Design an enzyme around this catalytic site. Structure first.
Site, PDB file in Angstrom:
ATOM      1  N   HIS A 212       0.830  -1.205   0.000  1.00 25.65           N
ATOM      2  CA  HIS A 212       0.000   0.000   0.000  1.00 25.65           C
ATOM      3  C   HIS A 212       0.867   1.258   0.000  1.00 25.65           C
ATOM      4  O   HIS A 212       0.670   2.170  -0.809  1.00 25.65           O
ATOM      5  CB  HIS A 212      -0.925  -0.006   1.219  1.00 25.65           C
ATOM      6  N   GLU A 213       1.836   1.313   0.905  1.00 25.46           N
ATOM      7  CA  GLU A 213       2.706   2.482   0.969  1.00 25.46           C
ATOM      8  C   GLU A 213       3.597   2.598  -0.268  1.00 25.46           C
ATOM      9  O   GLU A 213       3.922   3.703  -0.707  1.00 25.46           O
ATOM     10  CB  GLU A 213       3.539   2.483   2.254  1.00 25.46           C
ATOM     11  N   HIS A 216       1.584   4.381  -2.890  1.00 30.16           N
ATOM     12  CA  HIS A 216       1.686   5.816  -2.626  1.00 30.16           C
ATOM     13  C   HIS A 216       3.042   6.336  -3.090  1.00 30.16           C
ATOM     14  O   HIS A 216       3.131   7.387  -3.725  1.00 30.16           O
ATOM     15  CB  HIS A 216       1.533   6.119  -1.137  1.00 30.16           C
ATOM     16  N   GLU A 239      -6.229   8.123  -1.460  1.00 33.97           N
ATOM     17  CA  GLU A 239      -6.423   6.873  -0.729  1.00 33.97           C
ATOM     18  C   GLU A 239      -7.357   5.904  -1.457  1.00 33.97           C
ATOM     19  O   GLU A 239      -7.099   4.697  -1.488  1.00 33.97           O
ATOM     20  CB  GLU A 239      -6.930   7.131   0.696  1.00 33.97           C
TER      21      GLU A 239
HETATM   22 ZN   LIG Z   1      -2.799   5.157   2.244  1.00 31.11          ZN
END
Ligand SMILES: [Zn+2]
Ligand code: NI
Length: 394
Positions: A212-213, A216, A239
């Site tokens: 997830h990171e 990003h 998000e």
């Molecule tokens: Zn996030």
């Protein structure tokens, strides 16, 4: 990605892939020991007191949120043994991600995503931005500036607040102008979060959390992150797209096209800048080499004359990969693990874990170890069935 060296925290420094470094962040910080696990990717097993000057102490503030929203321990990651386990944990999670075709693609995109050289004031000179480097101590105590794309670092005061941090520019919006900036991911492999699927109480696979990171980080390295002030009924655009799946439908299609067009023009500017370029600062980098590096990154087209332009077809492919293909949802499908279905988690829990021992967690199976009674029904992620692997903080 593939981390071809198995580091121990106490391994001797060599000034190349095991070194004491300083972070661009102003202030005379003590140098910290760091490990280069892959081209352009470093791990710093320290609590992040460095990236934000207003977040330099690890004690719980008087009005801290309580478990399971936040968790505080000023002493977490303060010892050599903890740092060794952290390094080994983070490394294992990279292998887990790399073992999937999707993760292989993501990690490749990340390594290619060198932050743009937009540091000069002369619009004909290419120049690295200082805050996209670290200073690596050399044998004689001098420092060598090294470019990098990604740093995994321990959390700041709130141990379970993971996120991408990066150094800003006085005028440039690096994560939103196509330039990109070195990403520092506050992350710990030593804790994870619960969700409900009396419903069973499950734990998120840390590899999904890290992925997830990394997603990003990918947006931010290509300078296409969406301003957090842009939300939909509320959760931020950034998000929702990153989480993917069901909740992505709440993203306004028109707003989505606005940004694709916006960042299209941002890539075009970058190409023009490259064409304009006459000088370059530094040593081991020819201007031709760097132009080629950024041709590679932004998938630019180059004519016989050597002139750069953005191919709308190539751009569409790249943009879709970064924003639509790299999603937490899609990683869950590749790992074949259980994960919460919706971005907002109204039944949070926090657990202490230890991913490093092979008996606990593997590159290929995470907690759901094949040929054990943890293999079926996500038993490995079930905090009640696999209770020895999850110590509830609260
Ligand atoms: Zn996030
Ligand atoms: Ni629905």
């Amino acid at each position: 990605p593939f981390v071809n060296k198995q580091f121990n925290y106490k391994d001797p420094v060599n000034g190349v892939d095991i070194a004491y470094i300083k972070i661009p962040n102003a202030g005379q910080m003590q140098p910290v020991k760091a490990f280069k696990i892959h081209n352009k990717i470093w791990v710093i097993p320290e609590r992040d007191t460095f990236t934000n000057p207003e977040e330099g102490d690890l004690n719980p503030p008087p009005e801290a949120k309580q478990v399971p929203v936040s968790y505080y321990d000023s002493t977490y990651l303060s010892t050599d043994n903890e740092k060794d386990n952290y390094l080994k944990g983070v490394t294992k999670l990279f292998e887990r991600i790399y073992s999937t075709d999707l993760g292989r693609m993501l990690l490749t995109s990340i390594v290619r995503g060198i932050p743009f050289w937009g540091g000069s004031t002369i619009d004909t000179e290419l120049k690295v931005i200082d805050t996209n480097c670290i200073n690596v101590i050399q044998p004689d105590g001098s420092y060598r500036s090294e470019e990098l794309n990604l740093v995994i670092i321990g959390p700041s005061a709130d141990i379970i607040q993971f996120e991408c941090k990066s150094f800003g520019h006085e005028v440039l919006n690096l994560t939103r102008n196509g330039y990109g900036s070195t990403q520092y991911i506050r992350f710990s492999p030593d804790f994870t979060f619960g969700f409900e699927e009396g419903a069973g109480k499950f734990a998120t696979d840390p590899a999904v959390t890290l992925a997830h990171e990394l997603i990003h980080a990918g947006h931010r390295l290509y300078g296409i992150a969406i301003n957090p002030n842009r939300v939909f009924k509320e959760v931020s655009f950034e998000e929702l797209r990153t989480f993917g799946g069901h909740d992505a439908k709440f993203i306004d299609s028109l707003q989505e096209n606005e940004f694709r067009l916006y960042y299209y023009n941002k890539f075009k500017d970058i190409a023009s800048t490259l064409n304009k370029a006459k000088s370059i600062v530094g040593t081991t980098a020819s201007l031709q080499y760097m132009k080629n590096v950024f041709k590679e990154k932004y998938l630019l087209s180059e004519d016989t004359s050597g002139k750069f332009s953005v191919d709308k077809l190539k751009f569409d492919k790249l943009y879709k990969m970064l924003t639509e293909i790299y999603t937490e949802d899609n990683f869950v499908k590749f790992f074949k693990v259980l994960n919460r279905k919706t971005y907002l988690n109204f039944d949070k829990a926090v657990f202490k874990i230890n991913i490093v021992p092979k008996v606990n967690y593997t590159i290929y199976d995470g907690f759901n170890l094949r040929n054990t009674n943890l293999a079926a029904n996500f038993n490995g992620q079930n905090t009640e069935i696999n209770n020895m692997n999850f110590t509830k903080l609260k």
